[PDB]
């Protein structure tokens, strides 16, 4: 039967910033600290003053560069405390759906090669990705003539995402906007293999 | 007794063992500025392993090196499946608390 | 020395931490099972729709022996 060979890649940008501690974790931090002093075993004022003013003089880099943008979905730095997933709008001759970056593969190209090609096909950048194994993360088949779409997985080591103002609609979705942007069940279930954490 | 149907009812040594693509021996090296953080992460990863049914042989540590000190820990792992390895290391990646060094180095 | 009220607050702290980390491990295990079954059904579909690709799906990449990736930070460069 005539089969439409299609692959894809569910890119993962890891969180560079650790998630903030909840007040519950803060209470447990206070408890572990106080038991630490309880279990511990044995002019300082000037040194303490110098050290605290050294702490004060340098301002810590903000953990959240997100409150000020509110619209920079195309920016690689949309979120820091959580993972990000690339997601580009696509327009077909008969369909127009917010679709995870797909690609066409041939039997002469293996799945890993298709993923590597997709790494720089639509982004036209110098991004640095890493693959773990050939085992996929999801499959979704929609027919009109057969078809299948393979949602793979990769981790971003580094990225020179040049010309961030790309003509495409690359939006970084962590978990929440997935269901807002991808309505059909064949595309809204990506969270099943996206690491929600 | 040998000739009775109950022969060998008391044998146990056969129940004691004293001594498809899958990994080899995996060493996870954790060098960390904190004894407390290193120990906590070692406990967490060991708990993940023994909850996911991973053969863990050793959880020893390297000797300290001074050049402040960094405490080192080792976790031994054996037995991974295709998807299982992926989930295992992605969970490890996402569950690293603060400024710790992982590794998937091999023996020797 | 210590008092009764602080001890009671400590006990309630232990109780609420038990509940919190129980929810934590429950959600972690839910993610585990969800994506594991997703990958199992993915492999099954790949086997069904491709008899020559499931054999090469099980092979493992040889670049993972010297794996390296740093953890989170607070002040990005």
């Amino acid at each position: 039967s005539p089969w439409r060979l299609l692959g894809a890649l569910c890119l993962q940008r890891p969180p560079v910033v650790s998630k903030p501690l909840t007040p519950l974790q803060e209470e447990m931090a206070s408890l572990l600290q106080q038991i630490e002093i309880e279990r511990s075993l044995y002019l300082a004022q000037d040194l303490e003053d110098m050290w605290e003013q050294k702490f004060l003089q340098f301002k810590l880099g903000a953990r959240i560069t997100e409150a000020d943008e509110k619209n920079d979905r195309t920016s690689l730095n949309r979120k820091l405390d959580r993972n990000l997933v690339l997601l580009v709008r696509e327009k077909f001759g008969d369909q127009d759906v917010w679709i995870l970056p797909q690609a066409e593969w041939q039997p002469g190209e293996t799945l890993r090669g298709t993923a590597e090609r997709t790494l720089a096909t639509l982004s036209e950048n110098n991004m640095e990705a890493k693959f773990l194994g050939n085992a996929p993360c999801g499959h979704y088949t929609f027919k009109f003539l057969g078809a299948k779409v393979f949602f793979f997985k990769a981790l971003l080591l580094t990225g020179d995402f040049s010309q961030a103002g790309n003509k495409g609609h690359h939006v970084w979705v962590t978990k929440d906007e997935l269901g807002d942007y991808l309505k059909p069940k064949y595309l809204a279930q990506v969270r099943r293999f996206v690491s929600d954490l | 007794y040998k000739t009775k149907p109950t022969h060998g009812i008391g044998k146990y040594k056969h129940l004691i063992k004293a001594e498809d693509y899958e990994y080899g021996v995996l060493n996870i090296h954790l060098t960390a500025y904190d004894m407390t953080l290193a120990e906590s992460y070692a406990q967490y990863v060991h708990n993940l392993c023994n909850s996911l049914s991973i053969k863990v042989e050793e959880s020893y540590a390297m000797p300290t090196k001074t050049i402040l000190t960094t405490h080192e820990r080792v976790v031994q792992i054996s037995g991974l499946s295709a998807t299982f390895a992926e989930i295992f290391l992605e969970i490890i990646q996402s569950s690293l608390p603060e400024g710790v060094r992982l590794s998937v180095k091999e023996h020797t | 020395e210590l008092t009764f009220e602080e001890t009671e607050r400590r006990a309630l702290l232990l109780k609420k931490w038990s509940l919190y980390k129980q929810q934590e491990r429950k959600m972690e295990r839910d993610t585990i099972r969800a994506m594991l079954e997703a990958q199992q059904e993915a492999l099954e579909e790949l086997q069904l729709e491709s008899p020559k690709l499931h054999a090469e799906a099980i092979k493992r990449d040889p670049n993972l022996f010297p794996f390296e990736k740093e953890g989170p930070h607070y002040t990005p460069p």
């Binding site: 040194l47 702490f55 880099g61 | 400024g99 | 930070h73 607070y74 002040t75």
Partner: peptide, 28 residues
């Protein structure tokens, strides 16, 4: 043991349980 922030070479502040709270460490 105290929570001192440390940076190795490129401005990545990490808490460490370190004596004598410095609140800022930089390896040259």
């Amino acid at each position: 043991l105290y929570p001192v922030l440390l940076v190795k070479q490129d401005g990545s502040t990490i808490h460490i349980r370190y004596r004598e709270p410095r609140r800022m460490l930089a390896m040259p």
